[PDB]
From a paper:
Enterovirus 71 ([name]), a nonenveloped single-strand RNA virus belonging to the Picornaviridae family, is a major causative agent of hand-foot-and-mouth disease and herpangina in children in the Asia-Pacific region. [name] virions have icosahedral symmetry and a diameter of approximately 30 nm, comprising 60 copies of the four protein subunits VP1 to VP4 (5).
In contrast, D6 destabilizes the capsid only slightly but interferes more potently with the attachment of the virus to the host cells. The cryo-EM structures of E-particle-D6-Fab and E-particle-A9-Fab were determined to overall resolutions of 4.9 Å and 6.8 Å using 1,486 and 1,158 particles, respectively. The entire binding site of the Fab fragment of D6 was located within a protomer, primarily comprising the [name] “puff,” [name] BC loop, [name] GH loop, and VP1 C terminus (residues 280 to 292). Among these, the [name] BC loop and VP1 C terminus are in close proximity to the “canyon” and have been implicated in SCARB2 binding. The ~2 nM concentration of D6 required for blocking 50% of binding is comparable to the concentration (~1 nM) required for 50% neutralization, suggesting that this might be the main neutralization mechanism. Neutralization by D6 is mediated by inhibition of [name] attachment to host cells, possibly via blocking the binding of the virus to the receptor by steric hindrance.
Residue numbers in the entry:
A (entry chain D): 1 to 106
B (entry chain A), F (entry chain A): 73 to 210, 218 to 297
C (entry chain B): 82 to 318
D (entry chain C), E (entry chain C): 1 to 239
G (entry chain C): 1 to 49
The structure:
């Protein structure tokens, strides 16, 4: 009964510009984690404890947030990043976010 | 083979910045060309946690005064630094008679003259300054209040009947000397919220140190 | 095994486990050339100094930990609480004894340490912007004690992981059950108030949680027995 | 008068010059120091004190923080399995941050001495078994398996016989300088390693819990030392 | 010349620095000090002198000011009645202001020692009776009645036998600091109390006045002391 | 256990402000760029009552001079401080030859130079300064006049033939040293009316201290 | 204080004056000199090679 709302649902970057995806919570939260899911493949690990990066992840990805509003920032954007990004909470009922369809603009 | 650096005195030496007075010409800040600074040794951020390692302490402080204009300029202006011991009345105005009370040590110096410097003794009427007090002074707001830890106030002002012609900035450094400490205690691992009590954020309770994935991975 | 007595109090305890004399000092008295050499401070020996056995607390799997304040705990209790209250000044040393009674089929580990000037810090609202000061029931729990709510930081923003730096002793169920601690008078002054200032606080927390298979007694009684050492008082009222 | 020539450095303010200054209150006789128990004189006294090492520094969930203090062993773990591992890096992040030693290393730049970890089994009294605790000096990679670790400096621990055991780390030296990013950090490299394997499985009779925890306690030997006061902290006095 | 570096505080004027300065008249030989009676060397000499304590500090009417010096006892007062009361607060307002001790406490911030009040009965020689004088240490509330005060540290005074009596106040300490309004005052709290009750009534034969007065005289014991010179006064040199 | 603070010397140390000279450019006050200050130790308000605790006294005085412009500014101006012993003639003008009489100690100093400071001896031809004299000098207006208590005069002026270019303010502090006192006496409890005699207000005769309602209420 | 008169050369910087100056790190105990082979003390040692 702790819901995570992600905005926006769909996004399009140039690329070479920054990208700011948001995960908002209905109640105050301790930390947030992020996954990635390209099509046909399962979710991959991306960011944990809000700001720490999984081994693979490029350094151009960032993480911040405190309390109830957290955000994943990408600068700069490259055609290899286009995936769906979910947030997740670990305080009570382990809930996932709705995801954000990141896409290439042309 | 030597362990001189790990001594108390070695640990607490160094004159740190604990105060900064602003005496602007046009301003909301200290409009009467004077200011009162009750001695707070927490003024040096890093300090609080270092001293709060011990329950009781004792020491002398060497104060050094650095004054200039905001750009760090030197000008022909004379200044009065007044130390009002605890129990003595601080000046309410730029003409309070406190400025002339002999029992309030005062020292004068020109901005040109090198830094002013004086030593202040172990004031406390108690046998030692104590950072923690588990009681009240004879749910309350007087909890953890050991007042007998006051060192005094430092009143600063431009000399003369009239406002100074220049905008001034005084910085107060403090070297702690002849230190003795008792009853060591757990190193603060949570963020400080208030200057008075040890209260912390009951939501944002963080693990003392960096975490990891598994207890089998490095 | 044998039983020691101090007046009308007789406790059954083990021969002589390792005792912890806090800070290497023994609770002694205070000489004649002091602050109040006139009002010769009367030192209780008779009943005042004996074995008090506080209401046993029950260890549980979920237990977070307990703590009592001194001399608060006794200022309510008996003829000692008698002196502490109707007297102006107080200085006293303490012998504290903590014991559990558990079958060789229970497991746990309680750290038991004493901490001078134990100043409680509440949560402060939650978000950190409320300057709420701990109540009186939290600052001086009495003889029932009080339960920690944030053991990890000892309800005061300090790692417990470092509490060992204080006069402590361990109680690992699979090795011992009784822990003993001698505490000297510790304060920035020779004497002080017995009702306003709590020189220290007794801490007892489960570091390794209590555990057992279904069927074994689910709660382990922890019995605190304590006795005042070289206790002095001055200025009757 | 008396002939003099002022030399450079005249009129300067050195924040570390420990000269003397004029006493503001010459007549004041400060209240006499009386005897107070447990006076500390040199920090290294503290460094030799056993503090709980949060080896299990994995849970972060606020209400499970007490779990960092103890890690466990169970029946489910088969012989040879690696129970846990960590480095001998007092000053760096990780487990040591919980110990008092660790926190004190932070106010200093360099250091060296022999360390000492003590393990405490807090399981049921009826349990028994053996744990292999091995130390792989700096450079030596974490041993592949129990047997290879068995060839290194190791200790077989039977908590059926003794509930405690203390391991000594011969030496650790944070002396090798590093200028990575653009921020110079006098780092370890001496990340000595301590591995712990289930020599035998966890054995217990009916009626005893099939899990037990252990507590790590560390301190440094009397040969420990530190150099270069360096005030550093994330916790500071708020406005 | 001789190498030197000037240190901070150079050229400053400390109003309390007791250094030496150049003598304006080097050749002048000041008229020799001859012997003069009663030289004072340390103020505490004065504090040990008995001064009249204006316990009866109630009349203000200019021509009745001499009345503050003495309070009275009469036949009209029944057994047990409370004659008078006051605190052991040398430095604070009230009765003590009249004593020399009180006035000297004013030029100081802290102090402590045993005091000593002496009562003098100035009634007719033919009068007799008993007065109970009790001291209630700091904290203890003024005793409800004579009997309850009778249980405290008390003294039965029969002015039929001795015309004088001296009471000793074991201790008073103005050490507990107070920052009330916004003006910090190192106040008492040790307001020890001295109550005086008519143990018996005032008895007299025909021909003797049915009222008599008493005089309070106070001073401090040799164990008295003061700290922190603090010049303060309502009386100053007028323009 | 120590009683160093309750000594006479301790009680009377401290350099208090006893004088202040104004040397304005345009003004009614000291129009000739000079001033004469007969040494009055009552200059420090608090003083009178403290000394009037004793009948006779003896001591040396250390004088320290503080000069600046009204706003407390420092300027390149030289000054002459002249001490005219009692019996010596004070200067009637800014060119009186007294300024050059060798027998009148004089000291020169620039405003920039730190405070001027000199010690003055026990002048009095008598064995001690006596605050009270119950007689007349060989109903009168010469009652209570012990003249042999004069310390002398301090004449101040800007150096040079011409008026100074700046408005100036001199402050005179005085530390009393080597003090000896005799015959103690009742602490003044009434307000002072004149600098000469002990006369008081015979209407406004106030009780030494705070009064109360009844002698049975606290 | 103590009477003094400053003489010419006061406040000057001689690049060859071998006086003493204030130690920046008073508490620092520099790592001890150990024995190293072939120490040279006076250049003329080299000239004889």
């Amino acid at each position: 009964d702790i819901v995570l709302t992600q905005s926006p649902a769909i996004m399009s970057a140039s690329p070479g510009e920054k990208v700011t995806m948001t995960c908002s919570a209905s109640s105050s939260v301790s930390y947030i984690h992020w996954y990635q899911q390209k099509s046909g493949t399962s979710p991959k690990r991306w960011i944990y404890d809000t700001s720490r990066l999984a081994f693979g992840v490029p350094g151009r990805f960032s993480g911040s947030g405190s309390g109830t509003s957290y955000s994943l920032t990408i600068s700069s954007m490259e055609a290899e990043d286009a995936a769906t990004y979910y947030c997740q909470q670990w305080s009570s009922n382990y809930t996932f976010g709705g995801g954000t369809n990141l896409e290439i603009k042309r | 083979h030597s362990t001189a650096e790990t001594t108390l005195d070695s640990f607490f030496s160094r004159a740190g910045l604990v105060g900064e007075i602003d005496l602007p010409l046009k301003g909301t800040t200290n409009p009467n060309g004077y200011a009162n600074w009750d001695i707070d040794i927490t003024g040096y951020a890093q300090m609080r946690r270092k001293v709060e390692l011990f329950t009781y302490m004792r020491f002398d402080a060497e104060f050094t005064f650095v004054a200039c204009t905001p750009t760090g300029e030197v000008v022909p202006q004379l200044l009065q630094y007044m130390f009002v011991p605890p129990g003595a009345p601080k000046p309410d105005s730029r003409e309070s008679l406190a400025w002339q009370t002999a029992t309030n040590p005062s020292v004068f110096v020109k901005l040109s003259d090198p830094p002013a410097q004086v030593s202040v003794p172990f004031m406390s009427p108690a046998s030692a300054y104590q950072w923690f007090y588990d009681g009240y002074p004879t749910k309350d707001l007087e909890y953890g209040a050991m007042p007998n830890n006051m060192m005094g106030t430092f009143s600063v002002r431009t000399v003369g009947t009239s406002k100074s012609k220049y905008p001034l900035v005084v910085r107060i450094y403090m070297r702690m000397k002849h230190v003795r400490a008792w009853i060591p205690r757990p190193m603060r691992n949570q963020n400080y919220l208030f200057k008075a009590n040890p209260n912390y954020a009951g939501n944002s309770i963080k693990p003392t140190g960096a975490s990891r994935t598994a207890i089998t991975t490095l | 095994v044998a039983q020691l007595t101090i007046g009308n109090s007789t406790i059954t305890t083990q021969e002589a486990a390792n005792i912890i004399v806090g800070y290497g000092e023994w609770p002694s008295y205070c000489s004649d050339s002091d602050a109040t050499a006139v009002d010769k401070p009367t030192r209780p020996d008779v009943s005042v100094n004996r074995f008090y056995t506080l209401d046993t607390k029950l260890w549980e799997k979920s237990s977070k930990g307990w703590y009592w304040k001194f001399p608060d705990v006794l200022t309510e209790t008996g003829v000692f609480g008698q002196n502490a209250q109707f007297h102006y000044l107080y200085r006293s040393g303490f012998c504290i004894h903590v014991q559990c009674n558990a079958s060789k089929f229970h497991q746990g580990a309680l750290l038991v340490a004493v901490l001078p000037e134990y100043v409680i810090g509440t949560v402060a609202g939650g978000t950190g912007t409320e300057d709420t000061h701990p109540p009186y029931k939290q600052t001086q729990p009495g003889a029932d004690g009080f339960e920690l709510q944030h053991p990890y930081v000892l309800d005061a923003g300090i790692p417990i992981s470092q509490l060992t730096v204080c006069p402590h002793q361990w109680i690992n169920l699979r090795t011992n059950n009784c822990a003993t601690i001698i505490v000297p008078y510790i304060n920035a002054l020779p004497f002080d108030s017995a009702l306003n200032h709590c020189n220290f606080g007794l801490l007892v927390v489960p570091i390794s949680p209590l555990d057992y298979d279904q069927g074994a007694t689910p709660v382990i009684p922890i019995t605190i027995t304590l006795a005042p050492m070289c206790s002095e008082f001055a200025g009757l009222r | 008068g008396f002939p003099t020539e002022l030399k450079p450095g005249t009129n300067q303010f050195l924040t570390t010059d420990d000269g003397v200054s004029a006493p503001i209150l010459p007549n004041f006789h400060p209240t006499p120091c009386i005897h107070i128990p447990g006076e500390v004189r040199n920090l290294l006294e503290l460094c030799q004190v056993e503090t709980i090492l949060e080896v299990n520094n994995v849970p972060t969930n606020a209400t499970s923080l007490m779990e960092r203090l103890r890690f466990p062993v169970s029946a489910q773990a088969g012989k040879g399995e690696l129970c846990a591992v960590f480095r001998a890096d007092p000053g760096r992040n990780g487990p040591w941050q919980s110990t008092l030693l660790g926190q004190l290393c932070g106010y200093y730049t360099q250091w060296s001495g022999s360390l000492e970890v003590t393990f405490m089994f807090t399981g049921s009294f009826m349990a028994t078994g053996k744990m292999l605790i091995a130390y792989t000096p700096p450079g030596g990679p974490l041993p592949k398996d129990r047997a290879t670790a068995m060839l290194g400096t190791h200790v077989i621990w039977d908590f059926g016989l003794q509930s405690s055991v203390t391991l000594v780390i011969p030496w650790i030296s944070n002396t090798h300088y590093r200028a990575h990013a653009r921020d110079g950090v006098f780092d370890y490299y001496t990340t000595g390693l301590v591995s712990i394997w289930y020599q035998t499985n966890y054995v217990v009779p009916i009626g005893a819990p099939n899990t037990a925890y252990i507590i790590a306690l560390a301190a440094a030997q009397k040969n420990f030392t530190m150099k270069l006061c360096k005030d550093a902290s994330d916790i500071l006095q708020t406005g």
